[PDB]
Scaffold this active site. Sequence first.
Site, PDB file in Angstrom:
ATOM      1  N   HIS A  46     -10.077   3.416   3.044  1.00  0.00           N
ATOM      2  CA  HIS A  46      -8.778   3.231   3.670  1.00  0.00           C
ATOM      3  C   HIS A  46      -7.681   3.017   2.665  1.00  0.00           C
ATOM      4  CE1 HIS A  46      -8.839  -0.925   2.333  1.00  0.00           C
ATOM      5  NE2 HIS A  46     -10.155  -0.880   2.612  1.00  0.00           N
ATOM      6  N   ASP A  56     -46.301  15.819  -8.260  1.00  0.00           N
ATOM      7  CA  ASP A  56     -45.583  17.063  -8.156  1.00  0.00           C
ATOM      8  C   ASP A  56     -46.244  18.089  -9.047  1.00  0.00           C
ATOM      9  OD1 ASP A  56     -43.503  18.930  -7.668  1.00  0.00           O
ATOM     10  OD2 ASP A  56     -42.348  18.101  -9.361  1.00  0.00           O
ATOM     11  N   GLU A 107     -16.915  -2.984   6.526  1.00  0.00           N
ATOM     12  CA  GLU A 107     -17.147  -3.598   5.214  1.00  0.00           C
ATOM     13  C   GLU A 107     -18.123  -4.788   5.294  1.00  0.00           C
ATOM     14  OE1 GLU A 107     -17.568  -3.089   2.130  1.00  0.00           O
ATOM     15  OE2 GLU A 107     -15.660  -3.367   1.082  1.00  0.00           O
ATOM     16  N   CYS A 142     -43.682  29.540   1.918  1.00  0.00           N
ATOM     17  CA  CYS A 142     -42.692  30.582   2.234  1.00  0.00           C
ATOM     18  C   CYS A 142     -42.974  31.879   1.525  1.00  0.00           C
ATOM     19  CB  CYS A 142     -41.302  30.152   1.809  1.00  0.00           C
ATOM     20  SG  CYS A 142     -40.136  31.440   2.229  1.00  0.00           S
ATOM     21  N   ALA A 171     -20.980 -18.604  -8.377  1.00  0.00           N
ATOM     22  CA  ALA A 171     -21.980 -18.440  -9.437  1.00  0.00           C
ATOM     23  C   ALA A 171     -23.186 -17.587  -8.988  1.00  0.00           C
ATOM     24  CB  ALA A 171     -22.446 -19.811  -9.924  1.00  0.00           C
TER      25      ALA A 171
HETATM   26  N1  LIG Z   1     -39.780  27.808  -0.103  1.00  0.00           N
HETATM   27  C1  LIG Z   1     -38.886  27.032  -0.363  1.00  0.00           C
HETATM   28  C2  LIG Z   1     -37.819  26.174  -0.701  1.00  0.00           C
HETATM   29  C3  LIG Z   1     -36.928  26.456  -1.627  1.00  0.00           C
HETATM   30  N2  LIG Z   1     -36.855  27.542  -2.379  1.00  0.00           N
HETATM   31  N3  LIG Z   1     -36.069  25.436  -1.702  1.00  0.00           N
HETATM   32  C4  LIG Z   1     -36.453  24.517  -0.790  1.00  0.00           C
HETATM   33  C5  LIG Z   1     -35.930  23.315  -0.461  1.00  0.00           C
HETATM   34  C6  LIG Z   1     -36.499  22.514   0.518  1.00  0.00           C
HETATM   35  C7  LIG Z   1     -37.633  22.993   1.153  1.00  0.00           C
HETATM   36  O1  LIG Z   1     -38.241  22.265   2.125  1.00  0.00           O
HETATM   37  C8  LIG Z   1     -37.514  22.005   3.246  1.00  0.00           C
HETATM   38  C9  LIG Z   1     -37.842  20.880   3.955  1.00  0.00           C
HETATM   39  C10 LIG Z   1     -37.165  20.552   5.120  1.00  0.00           C
HETATM   40  C11 LIG Z   1     -36.118  21.324   5.622  1.00  0.00           C
HETATM   41  N4  LIG Z   1     -35.557  20.885   6.769  1.00  0.00           N
HETATM   42  C12 LIG Z   1     -34.914  21.702   7.634  1.00  0.00           C
HETATM   43  O2  LIG Z   1     -34.724  22.909   7.480  1.00  0.00           O
HETATM   44  C13 LIG Z   1     -34.490  21.060   8.963  1.00  0.00           C
HETATM   45  N5  LIG Z   1     -33.048  21.292   9.262  1.00  0.00           N
HETATM   46  C14 LIG Z   1     -35.432  21.711   9.972  1.00  0.00           C
HETATM   47  O3  LIG Z   1     -35.646  20.708  10.953  1.00  0.00           O
HETATM   48  C15 LIG Z   1     -35.795  22.474   4.902  1.00  0.00           C
HETATM   49  C16 LIG Z   1     -36.487  22.810   3.734  1.00  0.00           C
HETATM   50  C17 LIG Z   1     -38.143  24.240   0.787  1.00  0.00           C
HETATM   51  C18 LIG Z   1     -37.548  24.978  -0.162  1.00  0.00           C
HETATM   52  O1  LIG Z   2     -18.407  -6.004  -3.539  1.00  0.00           O
HETATM   53  P1  LIG Z   2     -17.283  -6.929  -3.947  1.00  0.00           P
HETATM   54  O2  LIG Z   2     -16.960  -7.014  -5.427  1.00  0.00           O
HETATM   55  O3  LIG Z   2     -17.366  -8.332  -3.383  1.00  0.00           O
HETATM   56  O4  LIG Z   2     -16.022  -6.230  -3.208  1.00  0.00           O
HETATM   57  C1  LIG Z   2     -16.016  -5.970  -1.809  1.00  0.00           C
HETATM   58  C2  LIG Z   2     -14.619  -6.161  -1.221  1.00  0.00           C
HETATM   59  O5  LIG Z   2     -13.903  -4.931  -0.966  1.00  0.00           O
HETATM   60  C3  LIG Z   2     -12.868  -5.060   0.047  1.00  0.00           C
HETATM   61  C4  LIG Z   2     -11.582  -5.287  -0.794  1.00  0.00           C
HETATM   62  O6  LIG Z   2     -11.848  -6.021  -2.000  1.00  0.00           O
HETATM   63  O7  LIG Z   2     -12.801  -3.872   1.011  1.00  0.00           O
HETATM   64  P2  LIG Z   2     -11.698  -2.569   1.281  1.00  0.00           P
HETATM   65  O8  LIG Z   2     -12.297  -1.209   0.920  1.00  0.00           O
HETATM   66  O9  LIG Z   2     -11.352  -2.699   2.770  1.00  0.00           O
HETATM   67  O10 LIG Z   2     -10.443  -2.652   0.418  1.00  0.00           O
HETATM   68  C5  LIG Z   2     -13.273  -6.422   0.692  1.00  0.00           C
HETATM   69  O11 LIG Z   2     -13.295  -6.368   2.113  1.00  0.00           O
HETATM   70  C6  LIG Z   2     -14.672  -6.730   0.166  1.00  0.00           C
HETATM   71  O12 LIG Z   2     -15.102  -8.078   0.118  1.00  0.00           O
END
Ligand SMILES: N#Cc1c(N)[nH]c2ccc(Oc3ccc(NC(=O)[C@@H](N)CO)cc3)cc12
Ligand SMILES: O=P(O)(O)OC[C@H]1O[C@@](CO)(OP(=O)(O)O)[C@@H](O)[C@@H]1O
Lengths: 435, 435
Positions: A243, A114, A312, A144, A335
């Site tokens: 949920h 970068d 899930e 740009c 475990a």
């Molecule tokens: N010049 C400049 C930019 C700025 N000031 N902030 C930026 C943030 C991102 C950036 O690159 C882009 C890369 C991809 C996108 N993608 C789109 O616009 C899609 N929806 C087009 O397909 C937009 C910007 C460009 C810029």
């Molecule tokens: O990643 P761990 O700690 O196993 O927890 C996941 C658990 O979350 C649960 C509830 O404990 O989902 P939910 O958002 O539907 O309430 C289980 O279905 C699932 O096993």
Amino acid sequence: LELTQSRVQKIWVPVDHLPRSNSPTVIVMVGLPARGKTYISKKLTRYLNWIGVPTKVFNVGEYRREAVKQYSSYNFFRPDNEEAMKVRKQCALAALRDVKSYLAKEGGQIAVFDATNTTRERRHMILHFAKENDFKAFFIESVCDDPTVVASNIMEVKISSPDYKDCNSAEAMDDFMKRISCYEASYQPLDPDKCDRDLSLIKVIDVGRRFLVNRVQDHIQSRIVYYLMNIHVQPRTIYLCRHGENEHNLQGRIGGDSGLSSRGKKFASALSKFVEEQNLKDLRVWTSQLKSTIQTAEALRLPYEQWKALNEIDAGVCEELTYEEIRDTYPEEYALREQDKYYYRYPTGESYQDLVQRLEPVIMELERQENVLVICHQAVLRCLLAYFLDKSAEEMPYLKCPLHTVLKLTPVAYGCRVESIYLNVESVCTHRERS
Amino acid sequence: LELTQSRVQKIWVPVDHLPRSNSPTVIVMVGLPARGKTYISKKLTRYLNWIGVPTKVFNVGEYRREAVKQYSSYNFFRPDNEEAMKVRKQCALAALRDVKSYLAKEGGQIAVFDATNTTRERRHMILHFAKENDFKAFFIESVCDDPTVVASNIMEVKISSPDYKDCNSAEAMDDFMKRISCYEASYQPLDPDKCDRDLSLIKVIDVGRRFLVNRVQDHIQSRIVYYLMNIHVQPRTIYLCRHGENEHNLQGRIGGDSGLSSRGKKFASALSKFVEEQNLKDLRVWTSQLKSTIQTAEALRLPYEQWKALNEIDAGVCEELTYEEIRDTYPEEYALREQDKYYYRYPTGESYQDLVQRLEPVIMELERQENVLVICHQAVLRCLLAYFLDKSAEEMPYLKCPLHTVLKLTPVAYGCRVESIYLNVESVCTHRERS
Ligand SMILES: N#Cc1c(N)[nH]c2ccc(Oc3ccc(NC(=O)[C@@H](N)CO)cc3)cc12
Ligand SMILES: O=P(O)(O)OC[C@H]1O[C@@](CO)(OP(=O)(O)O)[C@@H](O)[C@@H]1O
Ligand SMILES: N#Cc1c(N)[nH]c2ccc(Oc3ccc(NC(=O)[C@@H](N)CO)cc3)cc12
Ligand SMILES: O=P(O)(O)OC[C@H]1O[C@@](CO)(OP(=O)(O)O)[C@@H](O)[C@@H]1O
């Protein structure tokens, strides 16, 4: 033809009973400042690490900051500043020195370099370095000319930088503008129909209005381009929650397709009042294909879509059991789960890693969209939240996602504001500490 | 907040107990002849129908062929041929008349309008038609000036056309060349930095060496572009087959993760001799994460990769049962399966449709690659084979995929040669007629 099932991930592998024991890419950013090179950089890195490709950004600025007292002014960047130039080039090469060892010696797969890299000379230096280390080179150039767009950038992310601390906004703006023009005279944009016919590159034009794409050599390049066509910079809000409490939650049982409890339904209802008072011109709602998330949606009286991806984690043979019953019936399994929660896969079921594969299309649509409420499940929620808050695989299976709370994420500057909003309806705590 | 689980697909839906009861896109091809406009067209249509978006190609030529006696010569296409021009335009509008009713009246989601559409005038006519029917418009322009590439096309797909029957190759070539030049003088290519700043379009340059992309308005456009960066035209061979017979096959039982039988192992071995004598410079091997496919790979002594996407359809509660046991234990289920085999989903398991979602990444990597042996399972195999032989959802769950046979697919002209190769090792027949 004997084979043996690994214990954690449950992959078959060959018994091989003195046990003896895709090149990496350099994504090269190119462009004038205030062009979103670091924003595109962070955002790609977040994506790639999350679809499992190890990736690290190497921003030349930060090296300059580690190298040089405190920010004087734009004079540092003058092309006649003989000594700054020396020090800046030195920073450039230290960045490369660290890129070489991230990719040749620490097995990262992609390094994002970068830096402005706005002169054909500098780009030959990097290309050379790539060759002699058998690294691929991919150029992303953001181009740009709209003063609105630059002013915007300079305001959102530059004045609020470290380099400016000792400064009012007014002057930090003039200083940056003058600093942009230090690059203007020598900037040679990438050209596919001339000096750059043979470069693998993508040119982003006017913040994504338009793109020029040359010589896509592999999947990961192809996938970057796909990602870049799906992102945008329009401001918006992503709401995530689970949920409402379900019967199984009340029995303390995992998996299944149970429906909401009483408190569940109250929370559905509280969520409707919650969305209303958010006062959002438009909003998409997504759920899983399980009853819990769908009933919750029904409460909102807004239209919604079910995603099988959002279901899930599949607990396999352990479906519908309680954690205690799981310890009593399958101790070996419990475990292993506890010592590797991200990669552990239930017998005939899933692993958090498996989710991340599954949930990639959800991530990709979320980038496309504007306002979205995602009503899902605990593990699903952890994944999504990892993507958005740049959390690791090591911490993902332990992110806290209480019932009846809503997570409000606002993309901003270089990441995401995250507020929590608890909708005031009791539930059971389905967490269990980072063990 | 009452809800009810549908019987076939097993989706929850709201009891609503006088029951009362994303615009479509026109993909507009643009370019001179022999530029692969029909090839890109067929291939996109095959993709989209397979990821579930209904899509139909409307090639203006075929309308001309339904309209006009028998192919005279290129003179038909002369711009001074006043009457041909009238008849050709008429064909163009009949194509549009049918596009309007495919998309406004038969709910197709995309029509590919496969015509030269090389003049800004004609493109304004289509754009207009799109507006007044609230259809999106997406332009794919294929642009190439290499005589090698054109000669190539003309040889592979034009001389062997219907229009030429009465002709030796020699003359059909000169006739087509002269026919290309009938368009040359009025061809105005799409230009994003001029008359076409506001068009959603992709310009394919030199058979994919390079691309210009403007104003991607939605996911499906974004996905076309992704597809186009992944395809190629290099010649190659895709080999598909199943794992050798496994224990469950011998018990006549579905699902599970059983290992190879004796005959299984013999077939693994026969497959190795089979690949060797194919004499392929390079070859990728893919398997599922189930023991069967992996053991078969081991026999080849070549390196391979496992894909969870390739795992066989999940039979849910019916896992490990025999078909008879399934009829005896769950009759309601068996019937529903038999009357809707593509959409029927097992309780807590899967549907062929579910596979097609899952297998989309496999399809996308196969397009990227060159030679690939895919060792998978019966239903998985049916899907892949549907994509490649352009089979419907209605016929997919019944395509024949015997054990111990290898399917050799060669992309060619407008589709795929498919040879079968049985490796001479007995097995059980795990088919059951198109019922
Ligand atoms: N010049 C400049 C930019 C700025 N000031 N902030 C930026 C943030 C991102 C950036 O690159 C882009 C890369 C991809 C996108 N993608 C789109 O616009 C899609 N929806 C087009 O397909 C937009 C910007 C460009 C810029
Ligand atoms: O990643 P761990 O700690 O196993 O927890 C996941 C658990 O979350 C649960 C509830 O404990 O989902 P939910 O958002 O539907 O309430 C289980 O279905 C699932 O096993
Ligand atoms: N001119 C011409 C074509 C021709 N005679 N046959 C063709 C077949 C396809 C085609 O369009 C292409 C679209 C995408 C690609 N994709 C690629 O080359 C990717 N591997 C590049 O990312 C190639 C060709 C173009 C042509
Ligand atoms: O699509 P239908 O007719 O149900 O057949 C699919 C069946 O194929 C099987 C065998 O019948 O796979 P496989 O290729 O492993 O031999 C089963 O796992 C699966 O249920």
